[PDB]
Symmetry: D2
């Protein structure tokens, strides 16, 4: 019923293209994983968590925001932190037709907020660190693929930075494993005016 071999072909494509813009390569890969068994299983397991199943039922997606208005919010709030680093540094839209296309949209609309709450950098290691945190909480295909990819590309092309990469991966997974409050379960558009330290405390980043 599922074409997993096309998932492997998509991963081989991803590894090979990266050995030669960069934002669209991940979207093309993500799309190729929709046909796999892990795509359906991820949806089946997320729908087992009540607050996540509610978002699937509602088809919840964050309200549009103006970066300039977010920047005008208090000093340590989610809005201010996100906007300040967006100006210092938006995705491929798909029609929501089923559970898989919904999860894809929920992920794309919200995942760039994750690293600010989780406490990871916008750099390569920070992004691999964040994936390890997500995988520890709620495993989805792209997170598994991006972790393996990360490990392979750093050890092959920049092995002098492998220890650093493993330090972020282990920290990410460890912290994510001890965070009961799932990132994916949050209605982010309602947290722009809330302190980042307060959000971390609500999710129980320490715990």
């Amino acid at each position: 019923t599922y074409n997993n071999d096309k998932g492997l072909l998509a991963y081989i494509q991803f590894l090979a293209s990266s050995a030669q813009g960069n934002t669209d390569r991940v979207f093309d890969f993500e799309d190729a994983l929709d046909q796999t068994q892990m795509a359906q299983l991820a949806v089946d397991e997320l729908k087992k968590i009540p607050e996540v199943n509610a978002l699937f039922s509602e088809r919840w997606l964050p309200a549009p925001f103006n970066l300039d208005d977010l920047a005008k919010l208090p000093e340590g709030t989610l809005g201010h932190v996100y906007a300040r680093e967006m100006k210092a540094r938006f995705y491929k839209k798909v029609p929501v037709v089923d559970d898989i296309s919904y999860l894809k949209m929920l992920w794309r609309s919200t995942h760039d907020i994750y690293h600010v709450v989780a406490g990871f950098d916008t750099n390569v290691f920070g992004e691999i660190g964040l994936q390890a945190f997500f995988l520890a909480q709620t495993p989805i295909p792209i997170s598994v693929m991006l972790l393996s990819f990360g490990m392979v590309m750093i050890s092959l092309y920049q092995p002098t930075n492998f220890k650093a990469l493993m330090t972020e991966i282990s920290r990410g997974y460890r912290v994510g494993s001890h965070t009961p409050g799932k990132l994916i379960a949050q209605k982010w558009d309602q947290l722009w005016d809330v302190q980042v330290s307060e959000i971390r405390e609500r999710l129980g980043v320490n715990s």
Copy 2:
């Protein structure tokens, strides 16, 4: 000075062949990684640990053993445990010409003993668990490649067993990170007559 692109080609070869005996596929892959920068770096970092550098200097390799004589040793000894499970279930030999060909031989001669001391099964998950333990202690290219491979092949082809795979990977890395006594640093041929619990205690598997 290093051909890393051939390392990526070797990994793509490995992923693709596995999607179709199995022992020789890993040896061919291992050999293809000798040309990479990570191969040299692994040697450079291992030689920084005194007891490991001594084995490189000596060109230490384990003495030949007769499985029947090992089985005749006491109940809980390394020899007895290894032999009992070998009979219930030997590799590609290369001439030792340099540091990389030495490490390859040391690895091949001894790595099948590792899982009995580390406490991992001979199955697929047990082997991926063991790699995570080794990577936590002394990172070498094959261990990184086999971890990524594991993660990708299970999530693509048997995703219903991904949680189980992550459970072994995390346990492996966690235990390995808390084991000061390096597996690679041991003169295994001198431990056949020593209790497994005693070896685990010497290496400080708990710590």
Copy 3:
């Protein structure tokens, strides 16, 4: 001095992506072949034919045209035929910095004219047939890659059309081998007002 392994990675990327827009995939591939030895050798061999070496000296590229003005030319002329089928059915620009970036631009600016003079369809088989005609005359890396790709993708995914593909490939090569007048050597912008039958006669398509 050349990275050929990256050429193989580009081909693997191309095959794998083509097993899942389509115009940019060929450009990305073409670009990845610039680093190979065949890229330089193709330039070295083309520069051995005087008429071609003349365009390399001038860094000749076709003058801009308005499709509506070309359509207004007499019945059987190159301009009229091209425009009529363009309306019934433009590329990635690169700065001309050397002979490889030059040949890439010459190819992209002019190759869509080739099929009208050569007599091949705009469809998949017509394009693979045209590449066979081009490889018979003046071999360049993309033609070789596009031919192999063609053969592999049809035999793997649509084998019921393999006989038809081999009919276009052999016709293309045969006709191209018997055409002394090289396509690549022509200053196309000077032939818009010339009959297609006259151009075919000048190039000696029969011969």
Copy 4:
């Protein structure tokens, strides 16, 4: 009903391994193509030629021979020529269970004789030329794959020999297209005592 994606994975495996014994790599690849649609279609099309369909009915395979006894035959006979060059320079056996396993065995048992009758060298280019002759007569998946592979590996890794490769490929295809007597249709074990010139005349190599 067929897994074509596994055929593509097998080709990617083959290309990548060939960028680093060599006899078994082709057999593993050949085996991976049995699951494709082209495998069945090749059998369906071969069984449409009566002389071939006769061998499919008998599941004909050549009788065993002693190389020393073949060498003792007259000067220009098939036996003598084959044996003389075998001594100057045998395969993976599979149980014949269906038409695909049959064609695989017929191919492996007899294909080394082909080059002596067809007039191609035992070298790399001679083998690629022979496959072109075979594809012109009776197309089977391995020939298509071996042709594409050939073209890609020479243009990527030894482009200075591409002209020579295209000379053998076009000669092979041209000669094969003009040979009515199919190689695959011959009961070779009955021709050991027949002159090579006589066999070429019977098959109509010129025609």
